[PDB]
Design a protein around this nucleic acid. Structure first.
Length: 42
DNA sequence: GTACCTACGGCTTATGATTCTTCTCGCTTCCGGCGGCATCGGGATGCCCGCGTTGCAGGCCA
């Protein structure tokens, strides 16, 4: 929301690897889990 | 031995949009010059008489 741009991209690895970016075709990795540290930055 | 990314917040500066200033197209139509003729009020010219202009000398003012 702070900077919305369809061209702005740095990694793009997550969306490229989970789906094709639209998603009903490729539904690979139906189960995802996000492990994160217990600090405030986590 | 060294390089490149963003979040947390504020002012600015680097560029596409809207109200105020200005540059001047259209001719046409009611209106404003423009000329001629009868008209009328002023005045220049002449004569008479008293008042406006000026020189002299004194008392007042800047």
């Amino acid at each position: 929301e702070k900077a919305r741009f369809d061209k702005m991209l740095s990694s793009q690895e997550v969306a490229t690897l989970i789906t094709a970016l639209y998603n009903p075709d490729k539904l690979r990795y139906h189960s995802i889990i996000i492990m994160t540290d217990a600090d405030v930055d986590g």
